Amino acid sequence: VQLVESGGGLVQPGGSLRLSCAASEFIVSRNYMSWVRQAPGKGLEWVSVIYSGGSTFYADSVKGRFTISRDNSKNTLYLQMNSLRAEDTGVYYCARDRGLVSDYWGQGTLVTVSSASTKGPSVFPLAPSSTSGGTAALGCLVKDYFPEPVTVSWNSGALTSGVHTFPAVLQSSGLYSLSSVVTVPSSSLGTQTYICNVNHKPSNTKVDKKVEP
Amino acid sequence: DIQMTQSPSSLSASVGDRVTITCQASQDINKYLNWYQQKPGKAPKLLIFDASHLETGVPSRFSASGSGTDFTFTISSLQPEDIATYYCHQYDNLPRTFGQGTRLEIKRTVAAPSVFIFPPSDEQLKSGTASVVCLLNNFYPREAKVQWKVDNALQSGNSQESVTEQDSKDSTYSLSSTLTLSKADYEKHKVYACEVTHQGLSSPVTKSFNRG
Amino acid sequence: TNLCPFGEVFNATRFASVYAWNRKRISNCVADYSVLYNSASFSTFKCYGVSPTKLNDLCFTNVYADSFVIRGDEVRQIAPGQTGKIADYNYKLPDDFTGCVIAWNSNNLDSKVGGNYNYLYRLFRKSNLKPFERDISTEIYQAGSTPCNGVEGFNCYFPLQSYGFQPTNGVGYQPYRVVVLSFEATVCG
């Protein structure tokens, strides 16, 4: 009913990696599957496909370096990535092919191919101002982390409307920063607790920052 | 090695319009093109497969035709949840190819932004850096001018900004400009202002603070 | 004493679909394979065992002549060591094949206006064929975990698809009739 991908992360140029795509209603060993990647802010690139019968095909860009395979015993499709280069950085999607039409798509995992090393972020509060009625804005600044992604939520999920988690900007540091904001009623500030749950999986960084006046 | 070329790269139309994306193949692909929608940050949706056939569950306003080389994808009645990049995809020849992609933007009435300024955290100042954040919270169009006044001096070269993509129901944008400066520089001056200029603003609004 | 009946298999009025390809056995005869070679009307006349010109110069125990229709785009796959929908689920030549693969347009004959859907190919298959295997079953393909109960629907697919052979198709998407002669006492030349 779904395709759940994992295994992407930070790898050294020339390094190795293997992605996982585990399925819920499809049967990988009986079904057509292909891997499709997207470098940041760029187009899509079909990479590899595996047929129901087992025959495999690759785009010349990744041939001889990547290898597509599946394990029926775990109902999971893998993509082995050897000899990685920088241009291999991007989001990697697995898809079920309805015999050449990729109809159901996984949500993707990020393979970042860089020599730099992992930095967890600092979470600072963006605190409300001094009309006791109306709407005030607050937020959390997630400064100086690497590599991407970071996932920000508010009050563990209880607060979703009005949240704007901005896209990260790569600092002159070479690190990343984003900051997410939420608009709440001005009369909530004294009583209601607001906490941004920052999570930076590449570094086992979980922060809960309570935002207060 | 079949090259798929869509147009336009960028496209702006207001709600309910008829929107039309073409995609031409270098060689012959018969009906084996299909059409994808990729909402920002999610994966692509299959909309139309085999050049013209509507995928189970897709709205009827989406349609495409073509066979051989020249293909047309059409949205009949533009809706707010349709902001996305749309890609055509050739699939029958080995190297599978996509088109360039078509960024679709909803055109909308003017919406003036709600502006908020945020001083640096006392926790951050302990590290040696102080970052002042300014927010435009819901505006149309994307074009806005954000000026940082520290004391009464315009500041250039130390701010970065980012924009959300269009909101999927109200078609608005939100922008955050972030003034970065050192703990030393921060405590040298006192009046910190953020001046926002926008289409829908009768005159620039400033949101400022003093230290304390 | 009498000629091998190749006009029956080459010049025949209808051809098989590739998934249910026809095979003509040929023994007790003598023919030159040069009414074939010097026809100059063939898009493919890819041979593996022997050279096409020097062919009516030799004898074999048995010879088979398989015949089907595929897309010209796909004649590529009718050769030992190929992979693809057709080499995997429809017609597969063995790695030690000794014989010739012959093909020609068919857009005059096998193309109907608006689409001749008679010609089919096997699209789904749990595992792909052994050399010279013929699988004409039409059971619903179970792509999901839910059993299919013979009813076609999601993850439950009809294994055959129909060529929409149209006269306006590019030549890759045009019908091509194909004859595969394989050789292993009774044929000569």
Q: What is the 3-state secondary structure (H, E, C) of B187-204?
A: CCCCEEEEEEEECCCCCC
C184 lies in the same domain as C93? yes
Peptide linkage before C159 cis (omega within 30 of 0): no
Q: What are phi and psi of A155, to 5 degrees?
A: 50, 40
Query: How far apart (Å, rounded) are the C-alpha atoms in residues B148 and B144?
Result: 13
Question: Sign (positive/negative) of CA torsion C73, C79, C81, C83?
Answer: positive
Residue in the block written with tokens 């294994």: C159
Method of determination used here: X-ray
Place of tokens 């159901």: A104
Give which of C19, C73, C76, C88 to mutate to test A binding, by max A Cβ within 10 Å: C88
Question: 3-state class of C53 per DSSP?
Answer: coil
Q: Which of C133, C135, C128, C67 is nearest to C101 (CA)?
A: C67
| DSSP secondary structure letter of residue B170 | T
Does one domain contain both C30 and C70?
yes
Domain check: are B126 and B179 in the same one? yes
Expressed in Å, this structure's resolution amounts to 3.1
**In which domain, by residue range, is C47 found?**
1-114+167-189
Q: What is the DSSP string of A114-157?
A: -S---BPPEEEEE------SSEEEEEEEEEEEBSS--EEEEGGG
Listed residue (B119, B121, B133) closest to B177, CA to CA: B133
Which pair of structure tokens corresponds to residue C151? 């009813």
**CA C144, CA C160: separation in Å to the nearest integer?**
18
Task: Count other Cβ atoms within 10 Å, centred on residue B12.
Answer: 14
CA dist., res. A108 & res. C86, Å (int) = 31
Q: Cβ separation of C157 and A99 shorter than 8 Å?
A: yes
Domain extent, residue B186, equals 115-210
- Amino acid identity, residue C177? R
User: Is C144–A52 a contact, with Cβ atoms under 8 angstroms apart?
Assistant: no
Tokens 């289409």, located at residue: B199
CB-side neighbour CA atoms (13 Å) of B71: 33
Q: Phi and psi for A30 in degrees, rounded to 5?
A: -115, 10
CA distances from C68 to A41, B106, C107, C121, C164 (A): 47, 52, 14, 10, 16
Q: Are B65 and B52 in contact (CB under 8 A)?
A: yes
Q: Does the beta-carbon distance from B49 to A103 stay under 8 Å?
A: yes
Decide if A3-113 and A122-211 have a common fold. yes
Same domain? For B97 and B13 the reply is yes
Give the number of domains in chain C.
Answer: 2
Residues B131, B120: contact at Cβ < 8 Å?
Answer: yes
Could you tell me the two tokens for A52?
């129901």
CA distance C176 to C17: 11
Residues C129 and C149 grouped into a single domain: yes
Which amino acid is it at B122?
D
Return the residue in B52, B67, B69 with the most chain C beta carbons within 10 A, the one to mutate for interface testing.
Answer: B67
Residues C57 and C136 in one domain: no
Concatenating the DSSP letter of every residue in A48-109 gives EEE-TTS-EEE-TTTTTTEEEEEEGGGTEEEEEE-S--GGG-EEEEEEEESSS-EEEE---E
Residue B187 sits in a domain of what CATH number? 2.60.40.10
Same domain for C128 and C72?
Answer: no
Number of helices followed by number of strands (H, E) in chain A: 0, 19
Written out in words, the top-level CATH class of the domain with range A122-211 is mainly beta
List all chains that touch chain B, counting a touch as 3 or more CB pairs closer than 8 Å.
Answer: A, C
Residue B166 CB partners (closer than 8 Å, separation 6+)? B83, B105, B106, B172, B173
| CATH 3.30.700.30 assigned to A3-113 | no
- What is the C-alpha to C-alpha distance for residues A103 and B55, in angstroms, rounded to an integer? 8
Q: Are residues C65 and C26 in the same domain?
A: yes
**B110, B148, B114: which is closest to B131 by C-alpha?**
B148
Q: Do A46 and B164 touch (CB under 8 A)?
A: no
Touching check for C173 and chain B: CB below 8 Å?
Answer: yes
Q: CA–CA separation, C172 vs C74, rounded Å? A: 8
Regarding whether B163 and B71 lie in a shared domain, the answer is no
Tokens of B123: 């926790």
- C-alpha angle B70-B44-A175 in degrees, rounded to nearest 5: 120
d(CA C181, CA A17): 47
